[PDB]
Each structure stands twice: as structure tokens, then as C-alpha cells.
Design a protein around this ligand. Structure first.
Ligand SMILES: [Ca+2]
Ligand SMILES: [Mn+2]
Ligand SMILES: [Mn+2]
Ligand code: NA
Ligand code: NA
Ligand code: NI
Ligand code: NI
Ligand code: NI
Ligand code: NI
Ligand code: NI
Ligand code: NI
Ligand code: NI
Ligand code: NI
Ligand code: NI
Ligand code: NI
Lengths: 416, 418
């Protein structure tokens, strides 16, 4: 089904076909591509091959420097694009395989490519939808009997994030300065954050908007989910704890948030859908959906420090843990008439399962700095050190192939 | 004083001392474009852009051809100062260049009355601060209790939260009463329905000029270089939705259904004549928040409410920006201290501007004390929270000798819920 060979270890078989923005040494202009094997198929080069009804008059979306306009076309266009790509790669429509002059312009090596943020993100929201993550933060901060606050099981709690500091995989992250209060009996101090953390999340991009004042009913929520990326919500826990009452996390989150560049479309993930977790209490009707919209995605996080020769896997978790689905999050986010826009990023929350090996932050893995995490070669961590590199990966396991997400990586630079 | 060839009423918001920037279109020409308000006219900068011949602007005249102010904001203070001096000259009663060019005036001016204003910039990120000591005290009492009403961090840093950028709308945009989830009965599950405690919040906000690079703080001594100018803002709020949702991650759907700004961006140079010494802070802030430069402004603010049956709008709040405890310089410095990258056109709002006098409380949550006191809105008529069809208008002015620097309107009418 693909004339482009795909190795067994590839994140990018024919069943994936994610969208990203890339550039090369020869042509520095960011442009839209699709990953296949170790190659990128350049959609600006092949834009004229999308001849179907939804795209024939809208080929210009493939000439843009971001995915926003393609996202905003909606599901008929996404489905047509994916079918066109499938038919070109199988050579059912043989133009791309057989037009050698087009072909040699259209495919470039991933290894030689530079990736960019896939969209101009107008608004970013971070949810809090893993019951074990919220419970753990609760146990650590408020105690076992108060682990979950009263609203949590009733709505998908979330907060507005900082869009400007969402950066693409591979961007170094500087340890932030700020204010903290390490001794509650004394005034706060200014200094480098001491409790620098990662957060394993996933996120989706919004497709067509909704108009200002017009909620998206849950029945239609699936029409607005374009596809998914990996996210690391870097966090400065000492800055966070001091600032956050009563208006929520702010500078403890906004110094950096990393996403992976390849946006895996929802149609690629639908084969990996599983039943939705039972919610008790049942949510209010506006949040109810029968459609399965929970996904079996195997997630891993590695840490490698300065001097260390091998990265250690510190977390293995799964997106299927989450209590509230993306449909519920999208619907709740628009219930009040808030206008979601193409390229908005809605993140899941930190993805922790019940097994401590699956906790999605070092705040949890180290239990607030009370337990050392073994990172191999005689080294241990509670929170991140200068020079540490964190890499998140994710895969769906098919029969004889995997749909992978590439990398969501960053290295910590010293405070300056 | 100082005079334009364009006639200006004594109490006009838009004398030659102001010269605010905005984005407008007309019935003749739908392209949104950059203008400056003067008297009851707009001067179209796209038409006169070739008159900006100075060193900061001569190679950057295209910023005046844009559909938003972002690029001009991004050029920084030498460009802003050069544009303002060029406009003060061009609009002067004693300057012939534009005054006597009949055909150019025909193309360059249009009446405010027939213009449609648009949002002045594409706002990448919006942040709302919480910098009125009285407002934070009042909401603490009403949502949480008198004990620690002002929470332990408030006197040490300018508390703020990330707001929703997409739902910042220009003055005049109707605001639909939001649906959502609320918990009016503590002994029952939450319910879904129309908000019952719909509120306004009197704020001001500033737009960021040049940004800072990702990872690079803005030191407080340079913060003034990044503040372009100000608008009025109404942070519409759904207090029942807010109270149920906000612990522990903050206000969310209780704010994001709509936030209105006025369209004319008053540049900081226009406001500097109205600067006053900063309020004393005790405890003294940490050094990174310590600045001697005066950056508190005497701006008289007013809020009116007009019900769907009324002929006279009632003034329900009179307050002043000079009441705020933390300055814009402190807010911008704190926002970037961790390396967060502010970008041109970002909007940083002050917080609700409540003074200590109850007549200066900047929200109906406060003026009605969470529905326990009636607000007088005219003969016989009262409010606690906003009703369908109510129109809220925020205005603001700095008063000089024989002129004002005004802000135009920040208006919205409440539509019924779905
Ligand atoms: Ca934003
Ligand atoms: Mn997070
Ligand atoms: Mn507010
Ligand atoms: Na972050
Ligand atoms: Na609002
Ligand atoms: Ni892989
Ligand atoms: Ni062509
Ligand atoms: Ni069409
Ligand atoms: Ni309950
Ligand atoms: Ni204190
Ligand atoms: Ni099978
Ligand atoms: Ni004079
Ligand atoms: Ni006025
Ligand atoms: Ni230049
Ligand atoms: Ni005064």
C-alpha cells in the first residue's frame, strides 16, 4: 500500500500519515508535509493532486507555512486528503509514483529536514483529566481525605495556558528564575527554580471553529478534533505552589511547554479506540456521549543527564487512563459560548495511571522530592538537573505495524 | 494648550494631545486599516504613510498599511515617538502640509460617525492581573471568607492568570448570557443552565510593544520600553460558573465567554502628563520588582448601566486607575521573569479597578455584595447582577487644562441565553 518502503521500526507506516511543517537547507521556507517511512511527502509540491470535491478549490491550504487553514476546512476535507494520500502512495492513482520529475521534488529525507510548530496556536488550554494524577497532587498537597476536590468528577477542570511559549521538540528549556517561598515563616525569595519538572501529556488541535456565543454540542464535538501530538508541560513546582492561589498556575507553567511536530490525524487513531471509562457520578447530559473516544496509546518518558551514556525510562503510561474524553473537554470548553479556533491546542492533563511506574511527572515519581528515582549508572533524581534531557514518545500497536508520534524532547539549560 | 486645524470640542476625548491608534473600515471601503482619532474625525495612516520620512519609519512605512497594529507595536519606542511627533506636526493648526492639501484631506480623513471599529491587534495572549487591593480583599471575603481574604502571596507578587484571547471582542459586540455548570445547592449535584450571576468588571489593559526572546526576562528598568498604550476593558464574568469551577486551577469558563475592549489605543506618551508617584508598597517587594520611575496614572473611570426599558443610563461606579497597588511595569516584569516571551499585541489587563470607597467598586459582585445589597439604577429600579438587555458602558478620561485624553467607549449589551 506504499511504494515508499517503510521499515518495521518506523513510526510512520502507511496507516499513520501525520501532518507537519518542515524546512530544509535548500529551501528554508516552512511548508506542509506528511511523514511516510523515513521520508517527507511535501504537500506544497503535490497540491494539484488533490482533485476531489472538498479540496479542488482549496489547494492553497497546502501552500501555507502552518496547518491552520487545512485544520479549519473540517472533516470532509481531512478525509478527502487522507484518501488522496492513501491512493497516491498505493499508486491506485499512479501520478506520484510514475511522474519521476514530480516524484524527485516531492519526497525528502526526514533526517535532512528541520521541523517547526505545526500551527499558529491562538489559545492553549491544559486540562486535568487523569484521576490518578489529580489524586496524587491532592494526596501530596492536601492529604488523602481531600485528594480530589468536589468539582473534579463533575466537569473536566482546566485552565488557560500560555500560547507563546509552546515550542517544538528539541527546543532547549532554560531553568526559570522567579519567586518562591521555601520557608513558610519567612518572606518569599527570588532565585532559580529548585523543583523543575516535566509533565507527560497529549494534546489535540481544533479544526473548524465555533462562532462566538455558539456552543458546540457534544454530538458534533468529534467534527472539531483534527489530530494529536505529544506534550511536555514543563513546570516549576516551587514557583507554582507560591503563586497559584486563587487564580491558578501561571509562571510555574509559562516558561515552556514542548510539543512534538507530527500531528497524527484522528482517523489514524480510530482503530485504537477503546471503551470510555465508566463515570460515576454520571455527568450532566451536555457532557454525555455513547461514541468510544478513549485511545490505547503507549507512552514512554526517558531521562538522560550530563555524563550519563544511556537514557533511562522513568515512566510508561497510556492515554487510555484518562477519565474525561477529548469530546467532553471540547464540549465543556465551548459550553459558555467561548469560540474555539482552528489550531487551538487542548491538552489532556498529566497522564498518570494507578501503577507508580506510570505516574506522569517527577513531582509524582519522586513524591514531592521524598523518594529518589533511579535513572541508572548509580545516578538518582527527584527533580530535573541542569543538562537533563527528557524525551517523550508514544505508539499505537497494530498488527504488524505501529502508529508512532515521533519525539517530544527538550534539554534543560542552566538559569541565567 | 495646543490646537489642530481639525476642530476639537473642549471635552472631546480626541484632542491633539491624545492621538490614539485604531483599526477601522467604512461603508466606502471594507478593508480594515489604521487610523488616528482627532476631534470627530479619523486620519487614515495608510493614506499618509509616505509622510513618515524620519529615520525610524522611512523603511517601515508598510506597518501603516496593515490590517492590525501588531507590526507598528513591534517596532518599539523610537518608531512610536517619531510617528507621534510627525502626527502632532501634520495635525497642527499652524502646519500647511496636510491642512492646505484639499485633495489629500479628502482621501485622508473620514468621520468617526460612519466608521466601523475593529479589534486593534491580533492578541496572541491575554493575561488578567488582580492588582486592586480592595477588589482582591472583597472577592476573597465573598468567595472564601474574611480570614486571609487577601491571601499570603498578594502583597509579594502581582497575581494574574492566563485569559482566553479568542473571546476578546471590540466595543459594541453583544454578549450572550452563558450556559454552563453551577452548584446553587451545596446538597445537590451541580446543574446545567443559564448563568444567574452575570457580572461586569471595570479594568484597563495595555498592549505589548517589542517582545522579549523566549528564555530572556525583561528587567524592570526596561519594562517601560515594551508598553505601547492602553484601552478600557470589561471582563464579563459568570460568578456562579466561576465559583464552582475555579478551585484549584483558576477562573476559566466563568471568564472566557466574553471580554470587551475599547478600540482606540491611547499611547503611553499621551498618558505621561497624568503620571503620579507610585503607591507605597509594604512589604517592600523583592529587588526584581523594585522601580523608582513613576508609572501610576490619574485616569477617571466610570461605568454606566442602562436596562432595556430605560432612557437614562445609571452611573454605578466611579473609580480611578491610580488606585492600583502594582504598576504595569511590575506586571510586565513579573510576567517575563521566568523567561516567558511576551509578543507584540499581547494584552495585559490591570485587574478590576476597585478603590476603598464602595462607590468605586469595579464589579456588580462587589457593588451588590454578592446579591445582598440593591444597586440603585434610577427611579424605583435596582440591580444585583446584570439582566438580559442591560447595556454596560465603561468610559475613562484624564483631565488636563482645557482638554481631556479620553478612551471612547467600552460597551456591550447582554443577549438572552440559548
Ligand atoms: Ca492565547
Ligand atoms: Mn499540565
Ligand atoms: Mn478580571
Ligand atoms: Na509548561
Ligand atoms: Na470575561
Ligand atoms: Ni518509535
Ligand atoms: Ni499550479
Ligand atoms: Ni469550497
Ligand atoms: Ni460530588
Ligand atoms: Ni507576607
Ligand atoms: Ni486484531
Ligand atoms: Ni500650550
Ligand atoms: Ni468622553
Ligand atoms: Ni529599520
Ligand atoms: Ni485628578
Amino acid at each position: 500500500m506504499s511504494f515508499i518502503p517503510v521499515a518495521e521500526d518506523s513510526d510512520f507506516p502507511i496507516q499513520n500519515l501525520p501532518y507537519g511543517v518542515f524546512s530544509t537547507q535548500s529551501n528554508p521556507k516552512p511548508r506542509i508535509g506528511v511523514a511516510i517511512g523515513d521520508q517527507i511527502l511535501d504537500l506544497s509540491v503535490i497540491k494539484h493532486l488533490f482533485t476531489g470535491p472538498a479540496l479542488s478549490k482549496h489547494q492553497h491550504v497546502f501552500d501555507e507555512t502552518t496547518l491552520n487553514n487545512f485544520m479549519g476546512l473540517g472533516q470532509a476535507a481531512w478525509k478527502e486528503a487522507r484518501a488522496s494520500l492513501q491512493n497516491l502512495l498505493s499508486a491506485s492513482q499512479a501520478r506520484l509514483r510514475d511522474d519521476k520529475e514530480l516524484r524527485q521534488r516531492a519526497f525528502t529525507s526526514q533526517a535532512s529536514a528541520t521541523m517547526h510548530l505545526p500551527a499558529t496556536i491562538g489559545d492553549y488550554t491544559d486540562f486535568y483529566s487523569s484521576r490518578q494524577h489529580a489524586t496524587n497532587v491532592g494526596i501530596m498537597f492536601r492529604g488523602k481525605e481531600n485528594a480530589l476536590l468536589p468539582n473534579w468528577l463533575h466537569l473536566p477542570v482546566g485552565y488557560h495556558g500560555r500560547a507563546s511559549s509552546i515550542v517544538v521538540s528539541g527546543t532547549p528549556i532554560r531553568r526559570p528564575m522567579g519567586q518562591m517561598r521555601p520557608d513558610n515563616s519567612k518572606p518569599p525569595v527570588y532565585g532559580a527554580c529548585r523543583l523543575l519538572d516535566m509533565e507527560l501529556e497529549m494534546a489535540f488541535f481544533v479544526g473548524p471553529g465555533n462562532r462566538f456565543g455558539e456552543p458546540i454540542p457534544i454530538s458534533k464535538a468529534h467534527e472539531h478534533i483534527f489530530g494529536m501530538v505529544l506534550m511536555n508541560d514543563w513546570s516549576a513546582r516551587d514557583i507554582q505552589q507560591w503563586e497559584y492561589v486563587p487564580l491558578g498556575p501561571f509562571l510555574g507553567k509559562s516558561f515552556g511547554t514542548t510539543i512534538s511536530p507530527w500531528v497524527v490525524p484522528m482517523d489514524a487513531l480510530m482503530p485504537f479506540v477503546v471503551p470510555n471509562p465508566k463515570q460515576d457520578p454520571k455527568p450532566l447530559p451536555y457532557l454525555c456521549h455513547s461514541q468510544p473516544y478513549t485511545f490505547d496509546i503507549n507512552l514512554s518518558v526517558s531521562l538522560k543527564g550530563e555524563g550519563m551514556s544511556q537514557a533511562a525510562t522513568i515512566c510508561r503510561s497510556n492515554f487510555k487512563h484518562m477519565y474525561w474524553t477529548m469530546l467532553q473537554q471540547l464540549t465543556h470548553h465551548s459550553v459558555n459560548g467561548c469560540n474555539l479556533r482552528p489550531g487551538d491546542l487542548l491538552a489532556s492533563g498529566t497522564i498518570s495511571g494507578s501503577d507508580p511506574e506510570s505516574f506522569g511527572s517527577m513531582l509524582e515519581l519522586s513524591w514531592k522530592g521524598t523518594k529518589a528515582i533511579d535513572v541508572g549508572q548509580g545516578q538518582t533524581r527527584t527533580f530535573l538537573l541542569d543538562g537533563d534531557e527528557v524525551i517523550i514518545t508514544g505508539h499505537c500497536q497494530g498488527d504488524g505495524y505501529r502508529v508512532g508520534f515521533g519525539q517530544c524532547a527538550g534539554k534543560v539549560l542552566p538559569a541565567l
